[PDB]
Amino acid sequence: IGRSEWINQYRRRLQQLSETDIAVWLYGAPGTGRMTGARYLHQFGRNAQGEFVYRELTPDNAPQLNDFIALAQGGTLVLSHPEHLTREQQYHLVQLQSQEHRPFRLIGIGDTSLVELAASNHIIAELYYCFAMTQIACLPLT
Predict the structure, then answer these.
(1) DSSP designation for 110
(2) 43 DSSP assignment
(3) Structural domain tally of the chain?
């Protein structure tokens, strides 16, 4: 079973995760150190040099999505409460990821795994598609 195996197993995911440009979904209850993973992931990321932007998406700010993408460019982009985003907005996001070379590394931070979000609140399948492989439960490295 193991006690600290989970962290190393969790830690192992980050180490092997860092090379890939694939979107990572970091989820769990707050204080689970998911935020710490993104910075760690970004810091150990190839695009560490690139701007690192994290946005918590209130409805009022959810509209000016584009500024984050433009500002965020060449570097990791971190967002939460992605569920708010318009289907076209979800799709925009999703389309950019498709290119062989990603414009930005996309990390999704959630209380819960997508699926339970996607089920609970509708999320487009395409957006889900990148997410499904990368959806992770953060473990406190402290």
Answers:
(1) E
(2) H
(3) 1
